[PDB]
Amino acid sequence: QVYKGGYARPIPRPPPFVRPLPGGPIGPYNGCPVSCRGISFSQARSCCSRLGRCCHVGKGYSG
Question: How many Å apart are CA 40 and CA 51, to the nearest integer?
């Protein structure tokens, strides 16, 4: 059929892009205690960049 750029509304100009709203999973603080205890070295490193938690894990000589 022919192209109709005005169904009912004359010159129906569409709106521009709009800022969406991400929800995310519920209960994000369920695997990263502030004490940084009970987690692997790589696990603690991951939470530091994920929520700024456990960023100074490990200090001084060990073993």
Answer: 16
From which experimental method does this structure derive?
Answer: NMR
For residue 59, give the amino acid letter: K
Structure tokens at 22: 């991400």
- For residue 52, give Cα distances in angstroms to 1, 9, 27, 36, 38: 57, 51, 16, 12, 17
Residue 43 has phi, psi (to 5 degrees) of -65, -45
HSE-up of residue 54 (Cα within 13 Å, Cβ side): 21
Cα(49)–Cα(30) distance, integer angstroms: 16
Element (H, E) at 46: helix 41-51
